[model samples]
Target: QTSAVQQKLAALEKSSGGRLGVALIDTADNTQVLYRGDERFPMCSTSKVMAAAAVLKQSETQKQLLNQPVEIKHADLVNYNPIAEKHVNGTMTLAELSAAALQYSDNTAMNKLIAQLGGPGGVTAFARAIGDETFRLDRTEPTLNTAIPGDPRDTTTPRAMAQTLRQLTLGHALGETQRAQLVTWLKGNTTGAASIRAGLPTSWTVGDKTGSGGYGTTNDIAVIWPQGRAPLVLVTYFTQPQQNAESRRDVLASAARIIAEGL
Candidate 1:
């Protein structure tokens, strides 16, 4: 049977000039539908998924206060604004800055948060505890290199990304309070408009982190489930030079919704 999800994906790949690569997984059943997904590409800001999850788990183990005010050092200035001209030069709590990391895809906030969490080494420790073995943060110290050309560091895969979300959603990576806090932040995620939210119902609540790493790669690992049906997850990863981002996003969300229903 040709599932609606598969059909929508076919249509999206068709509309994308037949070059868009897609990988969607049903987290509940461990099923995947894919196209050219194994090839690793720089995850762009999508790498923030690991960074964000790392913060949550670290907060759990270290008992660090999310509301704790960490000083924004001079070296901590990372670009938290999408509009380069309108950068908000100031300080925010660890949780608040993490919020910016996911919501605005702010490069500055991400690095700053990494600094607070003790740099790439800190996040790496947290990733291992959560079972994201292949994920790696490019920078090891307090370096100002979130995005750069030919930087082999800062990258991940769709399989690893989706597994991270699954760990968070299933409460396997955090304790009760920490898990609650994780969901709180995830529910408010506002980045990655290309795939996960496009097809959801008007009133349905979906929490997701969308990563659009430059060099033509996009990823969204989300816990998407409508009201009454069994909760499910949808992860989409693509490496293609898509000029029309809106169309690409709409197709992704549609595919997610169709696949969710079909399951």
Candidate 2:
């Protein structure tokens, strides 16, 4: 029999004119449901979470405080949605910048974080360590004018991204403090209002990251807690030959609503 989530996901794919990849896991019971779980999809800005994890890991290894400030230079700036509007030439702590990156999906801030971690290769290494062997971090914060050479955008499988989120929530990848801090940053995320968070009930709390790309890619991964129930991790990605941004967001919102209703 088709599960409630599977039925919603199917409808989502059909209505959105996109290929969908989804994974849901109930951490308390280790139960999982997936559709196109093995397919690869671009991470888009959703890559920031992994990048943030790498930065947190380095802070742990170096015994540096996450509150330590880092300079934001002109070279670090990338045009797009940015939250650091006043600090174009100022300094903010890695923690502050991380919050902006995750919360606002700040492209410039994310690129700086990526650079601080030793570039795309560094993020890729961290993803591999977290057991997402196929994930790749190849592009920096891309602008409309910039070209992604050879289409080397960051990529991951739905199962892999979901597992990575599971580990982060369980504090298996980073220190307890770091895990808590990351979750705080995610809970404060302000950019995904129309996506995954849109579907869930107001009573539920969700920490999520969203991403969009030119090739019709729309993605979100979230750690969601239903009222008085076990938390579930959700990873969903969609791509179509035509980029219908509104439809994509609707699909994501509807999917989350269905999953939450089932729980």
Candidate 3:
């Protein structure tokens, strides 16, 4: 069954001129598929999901107030949205920025929160703390400051990403309280139009993130199923900027939704 699914997906990718890497895990039985689709390309903003988890874990360990207000300095800016500007956007709480980072793929908000969380070293420190080595951040130089080549924004493996989602959703990594906070933030934010949510029943609620960088890369990652017997982790990526954007997204979403609904 899985092989058939892979073959169909491969044909779909070829038709759309896109690449994909997906990992879908069944929580009820720990079943999964690890497929690579130009996954090593560049994670774009999907990396924020890992960065968000790192921040939450640190808050738990450090016993810092999750609600505490952290001043947003100018150095923390990174274009929260395509239209975000320094003068127009105001400062947000640490938690608010974190939520925005994942919910909307807010680049500036994430960069700001990452700085507060301790910058690149801080992000990796948090990931390492959680035992996630597959997910890596560029630390040789600052992400926003560096212009050198070969330093793709963020890199992660499908298996590593699925593990991150499962750990967080099951409350295995951050404990009950921290996990609750993480899940709440994720569910509240939903700009992604591909995978589970786009195909799941309207009654169900999904919490996920989508990342797209023009003609570069696209991604969807989430913990879905609101009380259904079968909950799943859907993390999918498609890269093919040179092709038609809408066509690529449609194909990616269609293939993902099929797996999501069937499982």
Candidate 4:
């Protein structure tokens, strides 16, 4: 029999009017699904999470707090992120910068993180170390307009991102202290109300990060809680045959709700 979850996924993909990818894993029951999950998609701001991990890993190796302060130089300034506007003039801890990056999708804060990790190479190195060989961290943030054709500077498969989230949640990616900080930021994330989190119950906490780029690339990677059960790791990606932002979000919202029902 076709499950209700499968039906909901099919409907969401059809409604996208574009290429869509999804990976939903119920950690509680070890049940999961992958709809076009192997395909690569532009990560946009979602790459910030991986970047933060790279920086945190480095801090751990260097025996420093992830909250270590770093200055925001004039050269680091970038336009288009209203979230980082207030803190553009001074220094902020790496943890605070990551919070802004993951929580508000702040472009400047993401770039600061990229810089901390020694540019794109460092981030991708971390991904490879964690068994995500397909991920590419080629450019920093605010590259939305200048991205080269056929070259998604920062990209990953739905499966890859979802698995990474699972690792982070399982304490394989970061130490207890570092993981707590990262999860705290993600749980407090204020963006992507129209995406996957939209589909789940408001009473259930969702720790998430969102990404948006041209050519209809919209994504959300989340750790979803269903009542008192263990959290599920969900990743969704959309691209091509571009649609309006609201349309993309609605698709994700529908998908999230469907996944929740299965639990």
Candidate 5:
């Protein structure tokens, strides 16, 4: 029963010693579960997937924006930009920038694409176009990851983020060519190994985007393709009671595993 999933999630929440939010939509039946899912949490690096979609939407008309090359300088990067570092002082196409942002969550690449879409406002507009009224990105990287409790800026509810993920991928917001590219970027993401993807059966395929921030904030949104069934959309957000707290990826993994078993 759905309540069983509820009970299990409550226990997980208790053990986490932090705030927890989980939401899942089973595409096969359109059944959704939101265990404290309406609550707000920081978007963190997870916002890059949205940046990816917003830039790709331009390709439907421009056809060459992605191939257009841009320069990356030392000052252009924020911390922890492994992908962008390799291309520093060199040129990278917008497409490569999008991949780095999503696949590796490179901070510099995310900001570049955000610039392409005209600041953080463009991403919010893209979400609104796809029926996601609650998603927002108030700033660029590093600052965007503040994760302060009760802060509405750079924050969104779990259910809203999950719906955005559904529309960006499974929904018709992007045409097949653009949609497939987005899906490929998500599926190839090097992150999320210790997050939701770790909790699922290897037989099932997974595409996910992850986020982390201060106050123990860690999150992952995934569309899991279970063999012989329609895919399931899952979102998990966790934040500890203290500032700058380190998050446990295993908690997300277990919660996702539980949902896989329950549903």
Candidate 6:
């Protein structure tokens, strides 16, 4: 069955109009279905998901951090900063910014929080501390969206990304209380309409983070509750080197459909 699934995925990628990697793991059993699981793809806004985790970790150590207010300026606004751009001159609590980054994928909110946590390197440190060696945050916001094929900066593999999602959603990376916070943000995400969630049975609840960038990159990682079964961690990272290529959320959605069929 796994081999059949792999063959289907390979066929999908062959005609996907780009390069892609995906991993589907039954978290309860740790059984995985993967394709190019170790290959690198740019992280894009999906980095915000890790940023959210780092914030929770910081708050764990500094109880007052979440309530603290962070002020940003117009200069901080970048493309696609929906929530942050609206309040460029206003202050938002650290908790609110974390929520904004994940729920809305707000670049400004994520970038400000990134600085508070000691920049890209600090985010990478948190990932490392949680045993995520293949996930790294080498840049912030727009620059991180370079999406250049084979450029390792701000990139992660499907297997590694799924592993980290498993840690954040079900393991000891964060206490139950703190992990709930991350899950809530991801669950309320308004940006994953075209990704995996769209391909799953509508009743199957999931909390996911979406990422996109140049070179036709569109990625998503999720922990799904498949209605009476243990949760599954699903990840898909797609990229095309052509400058004119567009982000392909449909590919991720289609991949999700294939995985659901296998299940």
Off by over 4 Å in 4: 1-4, 144-152, 242-247
TM-score for predicted model 6 compared with the true structure: 0.97
Cα lDDT listed for each candidate: 0.61, 0.79, 0.66, 0.77, 0.88, 0.88
- Tally clashing residue pairs in candidate 2: 0
What value of lDDT does candidate 5 attain over all alpha carbons? 0.88
Clashing pairs in 4: none
lDDT of 6: 0.88
| Alpha-carbon runs more than 4 Å astray in model 1 | 1-11, 18-37, 73-75, 79-90, 140-152, 192-194, 241-247
Name the lDDT of candidate 2: 0.79
Per-residue lDDT for 1-263 in model 6, tens only? 45877887788888876887998889778898899999988889888988889889888878888999888788888887778776767888889899888888888898888898899999999899999999988998889998987789999899999999999987879978789988888899999999999989999999999988889889999989999888999999999869669778988998999899987
Worst 10 residues of 5 by lDDT: 1-10
Task: Please write out the lDDT profile of model 3 over residues 1-263, one tens digit for every residue.
Answer: 45766776677767766677777888888888656732564556677777777777767766665676666556555545432343243556667777777777677777766667677667767777777776667642224322122345566677777787888877488868878888888887767665446666667667787766544456777787746577778777767645334424565576676565546
Clashes found in each candidate (C-alpha, N, C closer than 3 A): 5, 0, 2, 0, 0, 0
> What are the per-residue Cα lDDT tens digits for candidate 5 across 1-263?
45888888889989888888898988888888888888888889888888899888989898998899989998998977888899888978999999898888889999899889899999899888878888898999879998887889988888888887887788888978898899999999998899999999999889999988889788999988999999889999888888978888888998898888877
Off by over 4 Å in 5: none
Off by over 4 Å in 2: 1-4, 143-152, 243-247
The whole-model C-alpha lDDT of candidate 3 against the native structure comes to 0.66
Please provide, for model 2 over 44-88, each residue's C-alpha lDDT reduced to its tens digit, 9 standing for 90 to 100.
888899989888988887776577777777667777636666576
Q: Residues 1-263, candidate 1, lDDT per residue (tens digit)?
A: 75555667767767665234345556556777654445454566666656777777667756756777655555545444442224345456677767777776677677766776687777767777778786677573223223334355765555666667767775478777766666676777766455677766746667777765443455566776667655555667554544333324654675566655656
C-alpha lDDT of residue 195 in model 3 = 47
Clashes of 3: 2
Question: What TM value does model 2 have?
Answer: 0.91
